[PDB]
Amino acid sequence: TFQVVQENADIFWKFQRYNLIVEYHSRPALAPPFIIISHITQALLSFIKDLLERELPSGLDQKLMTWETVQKENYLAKLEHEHRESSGERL
């Protein structure tokens, strides 16, 4: 079971590590029991008044989608090329 499971276990760990790292975005920097200070501060700020998931300006967003399309075209061209000079296609 170890020999046949290790790889899928590692992939699952990477997926879980994503969520674990995302959990720290809203997590206060103070550990318990000092986290009561952070909880009170946030509650008071809410009552009185991220690296991930960012919105970009229109120009940069268009540039990035154009770059993505160019990279996809390169990927497809490389796939079709490595298919075209394969041994079976040559035969």
Partner 1 sequence: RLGDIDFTGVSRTRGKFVRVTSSTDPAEIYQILTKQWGLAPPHLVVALMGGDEVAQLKPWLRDTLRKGLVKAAQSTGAWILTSGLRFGITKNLGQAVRDHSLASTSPKVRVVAIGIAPWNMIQNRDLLLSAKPDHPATYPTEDLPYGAVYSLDCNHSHFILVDEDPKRPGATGEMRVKMLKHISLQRTGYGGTGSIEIPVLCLLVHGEPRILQKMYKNIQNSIPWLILAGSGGVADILVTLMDRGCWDADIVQELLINTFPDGLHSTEITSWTKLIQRILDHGHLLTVHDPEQDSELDTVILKALVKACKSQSQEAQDFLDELKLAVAWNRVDIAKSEIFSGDVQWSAQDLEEVMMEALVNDKPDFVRLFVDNG
Which residue in 48, 59, 80, 90 binds partner 1 (CB under 8 A)? 59
Q: Which of 34, 62, 76, 82 binds partner 1 (CB under 8 A)?
A: 62
* H-helix segments, 23-57: 35-48
With CA atoms as reference, report the closest residue to 28 among 16, 40, 46: 40
CB of 86 to partner 1, least distance (A): 17
Taking CB under 8 A as the rule, does residue 70 contact partner 1? Answer: yes
Q: How far is the CB of 67 from partner 1 (least distance, A)?
A: 4
d(CA 56, CA 68): 15
